[PDB]
């Protein structure tokens with residue numbers, strides 16, 4: 266999920 | 276409409 | 285108007301005495317249901333409940349003041365919300381189950397009988413569990429139900445309705461202050477209750493689309509009244 | 519461990535929420551080229567797609583949101599994203615009666631909203647919501663509280679045993695945001711009766727915002743099948759989470 270990656274991106 | 280009937284009787 | 289001149293206790297008493305009764309489902313003993321079987325029992329039940337809701341709405345303080353057109357608009361937009369919060373309220377003392385009627389108590393396994401019915405079944409069960417955790421009182425329940433009636437359609441037309449909505453707000457706080465809750469506990473519980481109305485609106489919209497699909501699927505013939513309440517959301 | 523959200527005071531809550539505000543984005547709108555069903559929705563989908571990136575990073579700065587697990591953060595944004603876009607749109611449009619300010623260069627009235635089938639009914643609802651904010655004189659401190667409530671509340675009743683402790687943390691942050699709204703209203707000279715009423719009026723609007731989101735979501739799904747409007751990969755994933 267794109268929402269997964271953007272949330273994980275720190 | 277049927278709703279007008281119930282709202283008056 | 286005459287609703288604004290009522291005290292908080294007189295508001296609670298008027299709403300409690302205006303409560304519609306709890307109707308029974310049709311008494312067929314075949315408790316294993318199918319898709320057309322359960323939908324037939326529910327539409328028949330909801331159709332009869334609608335008639336009592338329309339007369340309950342007349343006895344809501346401030347509702348007779350509105351014109352006939354405004355009364356129609358509020359009922360059309362809120363009727364499924366009102367049915368659902370009533371179902372959730374009477375399902376409180378039956379955890380994990382939904383009491384559509386005293387003789388029609390269903391669990392989520394029976395929610396699989398109708399296609400797409402499990403998602404909103406779980407949402408209804410969660411709302412009932414939320415009411416149980418908050419120890420929701422019937423005096424609070426009738427206030428929430430009247431709020432749904434007056435609020436859900438008020439931004440789709442209003443000054444008088446907001447005056448009644450404030451009065452019901454004053455009534456809810458009066459109930460929480462009477463129960464010994466502190467000021468901080470009063471405004472927090474008010475917020476907790478009103479946020480649930482957002483979820484009830486969500487369940488209604490999902491339920492409305494479901495009934496709309498049941499129409500052109502023609503699994504069960506819908507009544508003319510239910511078809512007219514459904515038409516107002518398309 | 520010790521949640522930072524539960525330790526913040528009311529004024530510290532407002533400060534954190536105000537500092538986390540996303541920017542107001544511009545659209546690719548060209549006033550030379552007139553509108554149409556395909557071109558206007560393409561502008562709106564392009565705008566909302568870029569807003570989603572800022573919304574995701576804004577949610578991380580909402581007190582208590584990082585304390586939730588990755589799975590719950592995904593669910594809350596999936597269920598509330600259109601609500602958060604709409605209350606921000608309604609908030610931008612307070613000072614422009616009869617018009618919706620999707621972007622500082624994209625100001626639309628209900629006459630131009632008819633260019634998309636079914637877009638009229640929700641355009642008026644967003645307008646009425648903006649008019650409701652106007653006659654309430656909604657404050658930015660109150661707005662950021664309402665927007666954070668939507669993120670935490672809209673998907674909280676659609677989550678077992680260990681995960682129930684995560685619901686209690688969200689309701690604890692929600693109660694602190696309620697304390698914040700009351701603290702703001704008391705500073706403006708509102709009596710205790712006026713604070714309860716205004717608090718109720720603000721939270722009742724969230725029911726209408728949920729309704730506009732439900733209707734808007736159904737319009738975007740049919741537009742997905744219509745193929746006339748290309749949807750971005752992020753919006754397609756957010757849209758599939760609702761149906």
Ligand SMILES: O=S(=O)(Oc1ccc(Br)cc1)c1ccc(-c2ccc(O)cc2)c(-c2ccc(O)cc2)c1
Nearest residue numbers: 326327330367368371394395398401404405491494
């Ligand atoms: O859209 S639903 O979510 O779909 C289902 C269907 C079956 C199951 Br099991 C679970 C969900 C839902 C839910 C509740 C009702 C309903 C009926 C009567 C009532 O008093 C309260 C709610 C209704 C309802 C409302 C009106 C009707 O005429 C018939 C049914 C629908």
Ligand SMILES: O=S(=O)(Oc1ccc(Br)cc1)c1ccc(-c2ccc(O)cc2)c(-c2ccc(O)cc2)c1
Nearest residue numbers: 562563566603604607631634637640641734737753
């Ligand atoms: O379902 S709608 O009701 O339909 C319309 C369409 C055009 C007009 Br003019 C009016 C209504 C509606 C409404 C608002 C939005 C939207 C777009 C951006 C934004 O920041 C907030 C809301 C959106 C929206 C949201 C996300 C998108 O990818 C595209 C559009 C949709």
